[PDB]
């Protein structure tokens, strides 16, 4: 679990989304698996508005950050699970690290903000939903 709490959108996995999250929708997308909200408290994550493909991100299933070096946004097949069918995620970075289920929506950091959420992983690898190209999560 987890999520990005910038100005009033709390950006979460689609997948995970609650119904209080879909009572108040600000935007969805599922080839993505990203699901923004709006919040009543003005939050405190910033969004990183760069080219790195370096970070450090936080994986639930071991109390730990990692630093990782992770693959540009790309349209990627993730295999079938119980939230989507076999598709292609679109927007989706890969990187080498240890991931769970459970382990969605750990952010991913740079020196510059909040790159994305922890989306797909399995076999040592981890995959996240890039939010770097969505300018609109900046302003009201
Ligand atoms: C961190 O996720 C895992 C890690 C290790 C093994 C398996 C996973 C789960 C995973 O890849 N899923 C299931 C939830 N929906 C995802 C999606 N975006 O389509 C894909
Ligand atoms: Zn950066």
Redesign the pocket.
Known sequence: SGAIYVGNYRVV?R?LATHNDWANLVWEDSSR?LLVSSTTAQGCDTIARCDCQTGVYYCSSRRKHYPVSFSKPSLIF??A????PA?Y?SH?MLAVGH??????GGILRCQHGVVGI??????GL??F?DVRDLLWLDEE
């Open positions: 996995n997948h698996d993730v295999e699970s119980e939230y989507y598709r995620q989706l991931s769970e289920p459970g382990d969605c922890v989306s797909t992983g399995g076999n981890v995959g939903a």
